[PDB]
Tab-separated table of C-alpha atoms in Angstrom:
chain	number	residue	atom	x	y	z
A	4	UNK	CA	0.156	-0.029	-0.173
A	5	UNK	CA	2.214	2.643	0.843
A	6	UNK	CA	4.026	1.828	-2.787
A	7	UNK	CA	1.365	3.298	-4.169
A	8	UNK	CA	0.617	6.318	-1.750
A	9	UNK	CA	4.450	6.857	-1.823
A	10	UNK	CA	3.620	6.607	-6.034
A	11	UNK	CA	0.457	9.750	-6.388
A	12	UNK	CA	0.488	11.879	-8.620
A	13	UNK	CA	-1.620	14.943	-10.062
A	14	UNK	CA	-3.672	14.363	-13.050
A	15	UNK	CA	-2.256	10.742	-13.566
A	16	UNK	CA	-3.917	8.589	-10.342
A	17	UNK	CA	-6.661	11.540	-9.248
A	18	UNK	CA	-7.861	15.365	-10.152
A	19	UNK	CA	-9.900	17.577	-8.816
A	20	UNK	CA	-11.347	21.294	-8.827
A	21	UNK	CA	-12.338	23.803	-6.058
A	22	UNK	CA	-17.157	24.818	-6.228
A	23	UNK	CA	-14.915	28.577	-6.381
A	24	UNK	CA	-13.968	28.117	-9.299
A	25	UNK	CA	-16.259	24.949	-11.559
A	26	UNK	CA	-15.060	25.414	-14.592
A	27	UNK	CA	-11.424	26.288	-14.719
A	28	UNK	CA	-8.722	23.827	-15.268
A	29	UNK	CA	-5.062	23.747	-12.886
A	30	UNK	CA	-2.980	26.252	-15.679
A	31	UNK	CA	-5.842	29.578	-15.597
A	32	UNK	CA	-6.069	29.119	-11.134
A	33	UNK	CA	-3.050	31.392	-9.067
A	34	UNK	CA	-1.608	28.935	-6.230
A	35	UNK	CA	-3.789	32.253	-4.056
A	36	UNK	CA	-7.325	31.757	-5.668
A	37	UNK	CA	-6.900	27.745	-4.434
A	38	UNK	CA	-4.749	28.989	-1.231
A	39	UNK	CA	-7.836	31.260	-0.260
A	40	UNK	CA	-10.919	29.832	-2.012
A	41	UNK	CA	-10.029	25.933	-1.018
A	42	UNK	CA	-13.009	26.185	1.837
A	43	UNK	CA	-15.779	26.886	-0.553
A	44	UNK	CA	-15.455	22.964	-0.556
A	45	UNK	CA	-12.845	20.490	-3.186
A	46	UNK	CA	-14.438	18.124	-5.491
A	47	UNK	CA	-11.964	15.004	-6.389
A	48	UNK	CA	-11.355	12.230	-9.290
A	49	UNK	CA	-10.578	9.714	-9.109
A	50	UNK	CA	-9.128	7.506	-11.751
A	51	UNK	CA	-6.986	4.368	-9.971
A	52	UNK	CA	-6.763	2.174	-7.036
A	53	UNK	CA	-10.323	3.203	-6.814
A	54	UNK	CA	-10.947	-0.567	-5.297
A	55	UNK	CA	-7.763	0.088	-2.502
A	56	UNK	CA	-7.191	4.174	-1.525
A	57	UNK	CA	-9.458	6.931	-1.235
A	58	UNK	CA	-7.297	10.279	-1.572
A	59	UNK	CA	-8.706	13.536	0.219
A	60	UNK	CA	-7.681	16.948	-0.335
A	61	UNK	CA	-7.664	18.353	2.694
A	62	UNK	CA	-5.289	21.562	3.254
A	63	UNK	CA	-3.952	23.382	0.505
A	64	UNK	CA	0.152	25.643	1.466
A	65	UNK	CA	2.750	27.383	0.658
A	66	UNK	CA	4.966	25.207	-0.537
A	67	UNK	CA	7.796	28.550	1.002
A	68	UNK	CA	4.847	29.860	3.178
A	69	UNK	CA	4.347	33.414	1.212
A	70	UNK	CA	2.250	33.671	-1.738
A	71	UNK	CA	4.766	35.316	-4.158
A	72	UNK	CA	6.563	32.245	-4.661
A	73	UNK	CA	3.665	29.868	-5.227
A	74	UNK	CA	3.421	33.056	-7.593
A	75	UNK	CA	5.954	33.295	-9.108
A	76	UNK	CA	6.322	29.394	-9.583
A	77	UNK	CA	2.370	28.356	-10.481
A	78	UNK	CA	3.253	25.201	-7.978
A	79	UNK	CA	0.501	24.634	-4.089
A	80	UNK	CA	1.509	22.240	-1.602
A	81	UNK	CA	-1.481	19.758	-1.638
A	82	UNK	CA	-1.703	18.329	2.198
A	83	UNK	CA	-2.919	14.830	1.660
A	84	UNK	CA	-5.013	12.172	3.702
A	85	UNK	CA	-5.051	8.735	2.151
A	86	UNK	CA	-7.697	5.815	3.131
A	87	UNK	CA	-6.484	2.783	2.914
A	88	UNK	CA	-9.565	0.647	1.881
A	89	UNK	CA	-8.639	-2.064	3.391
A	90	UNK	CA	-7.979	-2.178	7.083
A	91	UNK	CA	-9.217	2.464	6.131
A	92	UNK	CA	-6.269	2.907	8.418
A	93	UNK	CA	-5.920	6.560	8.019
A	94	UNK	CA	-2.207	8.071	5.686
A	95	UNK	CA	-0.622	11.417	5.601
A	96	UNK	CA	1.482	13.083	2.037
A	97	UNK	CA	2.370	16.251	1.467
A	98	UNK	CA	2.487	15.862	-2.179
A	99	UNK	CA	4.406	19.304	-4.108
A	100	UNK	CA	2.490	20.141	-7.085
A	101	UNK	CA	3.413	22.710	-9.935
A	102	UNK	CA	1.788	23.688	-13.513
A	103	UNK	CA	-0.996	26.294	-11.411
A	104	UNK	CA	-0.841	29.325	-13.458
A	105	UNK	CA	1.626	32.349	-12.701
A	106	UNK	CA	3.228	36.455	-12.961
A	107	UNK	CA	6.703	36.795	-12.942
A	108	UNK	CA	6.654	38.738	-10.741
A	109	UNK	CA	4.389	36.618	-8.417
A	110	UNK	CA	1.578	39.096	-7.863
A	111	UNK	CA	-2.247	37.172	-7.322
A	112	UNK	CA	-5.156	37.562	-9.219
A	113	UNK	CA	-6.135	40.895	-7.370
A	114	UNK	CA	-2.886	42.563	-8.440
A	115	UNK	CA	-1.772	42.908	-5.290
A	116	UNK	CA	1.847	42.513	-5.075
A	117	UNK	CA	4.104	39.723	-3.509
A	118	UNK	CA	4.623	41.270	1.549
A	119	UNK	CA	5.119	45.375	-0.419
């Protein structure tokens, strides 16, 4: 089972989208928009190991703590709560993923400049 957990990847194993932005893909959302709006809801669509595994995204953290960096790289830190459907044991993993929207100055969707 740990084999599968350490092999969990996005867009391969499972996908997601926020209830805040339904009709938008990952490349259209700044790490700052997902960080401040997942509280509205996260919907998972698992395409692998759904007999053996359940994946849930419980939190989105900034790979570095601040939005400027996340936004410069189009990256995010996904806090995952993985359940083993054989003994229902609950596991956790921090999956760092990139490929999200990004601008070169880290500015956010609102035009606010990083820590300035």
